[PDB]
């Protein structure tokens, strides 16, 4: 069981992340410059952070930089101010924008990601066409995934014999999880984004010792099963295209410190390394967050080459089609699955399409509860 102390720190992080997410989503209007939004989000996060756990030397910070990703972007986007062309990128109207960010208290982080439609306050709320399909695929993929993560039998009802039959059912393989989510996307003629990964979280860790990898494809596979006591960053992504991923040309700015001990030779490497250890610890950060972009670009090179920073390469839809993503931080307890921190529920009434999930296996899963 997760202690009150730990659960409460995750929860403090979630409330901060959800509040910053809401403030950042309001800034995502057509014409807004992405770099301004990320900077403002990061600023908000720090303000919110300074308003809690003030007493004592309680560590705290970002679990994830504010990122704002256009239509076909998969890697969370957070560009440099000194990259003139990138830093002038503006929100395009009607595009699906991924906003992913998060906070961190005493090494317990919550990461959240919502996808919204870029628009002005007095634009219509309705989403239609294949864009409605893209969103609904992602929504239902998420609802299905979350239910596939409830440990077998935890919430089974009925006779003792039914309850025992449920608890003795093996946790679904990751291949089975994948094919079901693919089925969900297909009902909307969308595809799951290859290798979309959910990670176990732990103290100072957002890429823990268990992970679920959706539609792995080839020489890749996830390992580990969700258990009562776990906290997970649960992610789903869909594409109006094939759901294939490809490297784009924007500068990689998203990184995180690893636990590798490689000795850095270059002084700007060590300098940036120490700056990051102190501010972010082992949590993801954007190069734009560092004190000096020129130092950032110089030192990051050896840090990545040496394996002490992990670099998250810039990727986007291989077909250059729009993508949709959700990321929820959950807790698994006695009572099932609780969403500690995530995106605000979507009003399904706003989505307009003829498409519908018809597969019986999937509709049945959707009837299963997430918790008691």
Numbering used by the authors: 12 to 383
What did the study's authors say about this model?
Expression, purification, crystallization and x-ray structure determination of this protein was successful, supporting the value of C. thermophilum as a model system for structural studies. The two selected adaptive proline mutations (P41, P104) indeed occur in loops of ctArx1 preventing unfolding. Another fundamental concept in thermo-adaptation of proteins is an increased bulkiness of hydrophobic amino acids within the protein core. Several of these adaptive bulky hydrophobic residues in ctArx1 (F146, F362 and W357) together with V128 form an extended hydrophobic cluster, which together with adaptive C335 leads to a tight packing of helices α3 and α9 to the central beta-sheet. Acquired electrostatic interactions are found between the imino-group of W357 and D124 (β4) linking β4 to α3 more tightly and between adaptive R350 in β13 and E154 stabilizing β13 with respect to helix α3. Mutation of F146, W357 and R350 reduces the thermostability of ctArx1 by about 2°C to 51°C. In addition, mutation of the two hydrophobic residues (F146, W357) on top of the five adaptive mutations leads to a further decrease of ctArx1 thermostability to 47°C. Taken together, these examples of adaptive mutations in the context of the 3D structure of ctArx1 illustrate how individual residues and their interactions contribute to a thermophilic adaptation. By solving the 3D structure of a single thermophilic protein (Arx1 of Cth), we could identify three different types of adaptive mutations : (i) loop rigidity by increased proline frequency, (ii) increased protein core hydrophobicity, and (iii) increased electrostatic interactions stabilizing neighboring secondary structure elements.
C. thermophilum Arx1 (ctArx1) is thermostable (soluble) up to 53°C at a concentration of 8 mg/ml, whereas the Arx1 from the mesophilic C. globosum (cgArx1) precipitates already at 35°C, corresponding to the OGTs of both organisms. By determining the three-dimensional structure of an exemplar protein from C. thermophilum (Arx1), we could also characterise the molecular consequences of some of these mutations.
